[PDB]
Amino acid sequence: NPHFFVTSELSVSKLLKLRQALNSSAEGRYKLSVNDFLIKAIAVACKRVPAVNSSWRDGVIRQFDTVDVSVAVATPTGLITPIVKGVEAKGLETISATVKELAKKARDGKLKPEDYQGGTISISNMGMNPAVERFTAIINPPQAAILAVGTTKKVAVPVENEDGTTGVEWDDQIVVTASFDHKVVDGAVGAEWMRELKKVVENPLELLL
Amino acid sequence: NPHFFVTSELSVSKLLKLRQALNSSAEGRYKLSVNDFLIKAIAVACKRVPAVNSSWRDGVIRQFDTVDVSVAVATPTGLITPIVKGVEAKGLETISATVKELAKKARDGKLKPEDYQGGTISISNMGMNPAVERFTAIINPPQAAILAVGTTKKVAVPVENEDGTTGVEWDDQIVVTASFDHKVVDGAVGAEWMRELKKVVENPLELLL
Amino acid sequence: NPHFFVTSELSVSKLLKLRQALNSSAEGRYKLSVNDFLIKAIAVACKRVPAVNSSWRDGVIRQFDTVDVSVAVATPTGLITPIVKGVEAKGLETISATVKELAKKARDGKLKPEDYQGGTISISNMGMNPAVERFTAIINPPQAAILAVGTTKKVAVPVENEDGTTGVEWDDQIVVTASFDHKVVDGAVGAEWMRELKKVVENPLELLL
Amino acid sequence: NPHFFVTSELSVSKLLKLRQALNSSAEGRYKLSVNDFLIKAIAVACKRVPAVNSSWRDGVIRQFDTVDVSVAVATPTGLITPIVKGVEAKGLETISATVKELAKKARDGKLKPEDYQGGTISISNMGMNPAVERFTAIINPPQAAILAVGTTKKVAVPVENEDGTTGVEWDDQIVVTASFDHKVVDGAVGAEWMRELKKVVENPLELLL
């Protein structure tokens, strides 16, 4: 299993501003987190290039026209992978309610058994606790790509103010990792998908596009 | 062998201050290095959560109540793994003398043959030379986790001084990597162990705890 | 295949200055890129320590006195690995012309079939597009080490000006990754090769050495 | 029974600072008092010189390699001596929990009968109430040394400030007393043990040593 690890580095301050604005405008019917924006962005990204969201059979490979995103949730019994289907068609409040409902279902017991079967990309995120920057779980056998998300730190970013020739103003910054299979997805298309994903995420206004 | 790589990023300036104070107070009977603090901290960390320090047999797994730490040393013949046992009970001067004596034994020849058998976590550190930030040797077959340590760089860290709204003051910072097995230790407990390890190391005053 | 991933972090501003000077002095007969300096530097580095540029047969291993560098190029059909031989003897303009000619040959069709066989280290570099910092393709079967190159970012670097006690002046900085085999090349010699490679690259004036 | 009384005078302000720091950093799982630092320090001190922690049989004497510390607790029924074993191996939070649990066990009733047998040095401390500076209970028959602790007062300590040729700044100060047997432990080794104990306690940073 030749799984090569690529990475990217994303600026999220715009996402924080948008999340705060939407949460303040909310009347309580929905709750938003950064994982919501990440899953919507990666759904749009997979719509952009369908190469990443494929599967490998015995010899032959199959490509999915639609997008099905599996999210990892931590349970005392082990690792659970709830699924959400048709993410591109849905908004972000609906997927928010779906993921929180699936999480609480995992808390109170076991889920309906076909919530485990299916999917195109597996997503894991321990950004809640600190002391984690990079990680990559093994790719699931029916999958072809896994995207892992670390925590958000606070580092200096290039700025070109006039009074200060160099200038230093700080921004929040996050690290993502992607493990592919190299049997279906090669390095070039993975780098393309990552760069266009960063292009989508850096300015969130194109999420509605 | 699904070995997933997690990482953390540690501040060591407090450790440097403590090491300098103890070395100045020393009368020559003991010599201290950063590896000493790392091995003591990880011993306490394994005491905190015993899940990481286990082993896998044919099908069944075995959990060790005590801690046995194997340290990697570079030799012209190859790679050697001296062992230290009961690290949690011992202080740091005793383990310091033990590791330096084992290192010089490796220099002058071969060791007693049962110094190779046993252990719970393997530790490797090439922080002596520069030009290394991340690395991860393969996990030893009777082990379940390996922690590798890079070098210490000097980077900017968040500060909240009054005169400067952003403010910039620099600190030394180190990178650690952890390769687990995923047959015994899953991602969640590994992240827990790493975050509590960083909590222990960041302020060294809890080492005596 | 126990492929352990080591990394380094290089300052390239001197290389940019030298590249700009040589390109301005050029009359059009040659074109220079950062990949040229990297391949020349790694050729000299392999000349420094011949351990990395070896191959593994069935049980026995073979060491190459000369250097043969294979460079990866992205093609719509897939991944292509043109080869350049005797790089240490040649300058940098000759290897520049050779690599650009091989790239355009890959563009317009297929190459002469023995351009695929041979080599000591495989080099891949997607530094052209942004949104990539670390990656590592699997080592080719007749090879023993692969060096991957990310993009160049702009980060703060330690400075010791008098007026500012800390001081902050920024520099361009690049990330490199190295995947070895651990059947032939162990961690120590890999770290040695990486540190001496960084020593060569940081100040490019030793390239002519 | 020729029990000669030696004494020492200790500065504890550093211990108060360390205790306050650790208690503030505590999340409630442990509670620390000065007696904890004293018992850990004397355990390390007995490890330093094993002469004090011995016992006398009929004619012959026996020396203990390990350390077992008996602490005196005041009960309405009389005087009770709970025991803690292997103190040097354990930290200070574990012995803290052990001593508080033994104290509350003495409060709610009688203890398991073998908690009375064994030990190397008996420790008594009425530092809680004021109006006590020196005291010394008789040595227990199977013991060879008893260390009693008074209360902490506030007295002037030598200082060498520049503006004030003499200078006066005040510090907290405690008095300790030691009654030996003179059948096993003579004056010289007792004075050695006391001076090295004061050396350990005055700067608590060597407790982790």
Author numbering:
A (entry chain A), B (entry chain A), C (entry chain A), D (entry chain A): 251 to 459
Q: What does the paper behind this entry write?
A:
The eukaryotic pyruvate dehydrogenase complex (PDHc), as the most studied family member, is composed of multiple copies of the E1, E2, E3BP (also known as protein X), and E3 enzymes, which all work in concert to perform the dedicated pyruvate oxidation reaction. Architecturally, the core consists of 60 subunits that form a near-symmetric icosahedral structure, formed by 20 trimeric subunits at each corner. In fungi, the core-forming subunit is exclusively E218, whereas in mammals the core is composed of a mixture of E2 and E3BP in either a 48:1219 or 40:20 E2:E3BP ratio.
Here, we report a cryo-EM structure of the fully active Chaetomium thermophilum pyruvate dehydrogenase complex (PDHc) core scaffold at 3.85 Å resolution (FSC = 0.143) from native cell extracts. The reconstruction of the core with an application of icosahedral symmetry was resolved at 3.85 Å resolution (FSC = 0.143), where the backbone is clearly traceable and side chain resolution is often visible. The overall icosahedral core is stabilized by two interfaces with distinct energetic signatures, which were calculated with HADDOCK. We cannot rule out, that this close proximity is a result of averaging, but we suspect the existence of an arginine cluster. Another structural feature is a loop element facing inside the core cavity formed by residues Val405-Trp420, and maybe potentially critical for the organization of the PDHc core scaffold. Flexible regions were first detected above the E2 active site. A previously described backfolded structural element is not seen in the native PDHc core scaffold structure, allowing increased accessibility to the LD to be accommodated in the E2 active site.
